[PDB]
Design a protein around this ligand. Sequence first.
Ligand SMILES: CNC(=O)c1nn(C)c2c1C(C)(C)Cc1cnc(Nc3ccc(N4CCN(C)CC4)cc3)nc1-2
Length: 259
Amino acid sequence: SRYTTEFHELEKIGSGEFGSVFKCVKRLDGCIYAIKRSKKPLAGSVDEQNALREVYAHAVLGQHSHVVRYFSAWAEDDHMLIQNEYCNGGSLADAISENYRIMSYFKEAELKDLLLQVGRGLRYIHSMSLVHMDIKPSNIFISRVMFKIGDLGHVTRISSPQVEEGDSRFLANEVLQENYTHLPKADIFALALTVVCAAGAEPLPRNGDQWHEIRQGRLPRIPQVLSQEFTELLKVMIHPDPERRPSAMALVKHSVLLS
Ligand SMILES: CNC(=O)c1nn(C)c2c1C(C)(C)Cc1cnc(Nc3ccc(N4CCN(C)CC4)cc3)nc1-2
């Protein structure tokens, strides 16, 4: 077993219908990696479709500060195994849960830092003519601080997009309308709501009235004191017209964020 041979398994850090993710130490270099382990999907399934998007995202993407690094991938015993960078801070979703429990928070500044850092990640992905298509707190990881985009199973081309929608909570209406002419801006829409989650918003609606209200450009209720200036940035990021939303480029260079 390559897995057993090359790595020692330390602890399970993730699980879902997607499979499991394990904290492992690689024997050769003593370093910690996150190994995603998944049952090999049925041929011609959504699962195989998902799986394929991730393989070829790696093939195209190089290393980047704000994208979870991919090291290798292989298969054995009808399972697919992917060796990733380990982020010792866990996910932004875990962090928000902890805040909601311990009763700390992300200061307005820390929210600006998160937007900019994930913004930098997107700028890079978009520059390689790809889109992530599932930005949300659980797909943003933390290394201790650095924020990094993970889970590339929804990644597709800007030009010839094969679109499996991400989480309905973070989804731009135009994508639901089968409009794929400006996919990068769906990532921007989705980042904005991710930040609003970090800022302590009540859980985001999955559909119904409040879902629609948001896609009219209406921000969820925040529990804290944010400047009108940062507010408008977050607001225009969920503008119903995707062309009015900042590109990742315009984002990373925006006056409010820097720095
Ligand atoms: C579809 N699954 C994933 O993409 C995925 N899920 N996780 C949990 C990770 C991934 C990646 C993107 C494939 C790689 C990765 C890289 N690092 C972590 N780090 C991490 C560290 C600690 C924790 N936890 C702290 C809070 N807990 C007690 C649960 C473990 C969770 C994740 N997680 C992951």
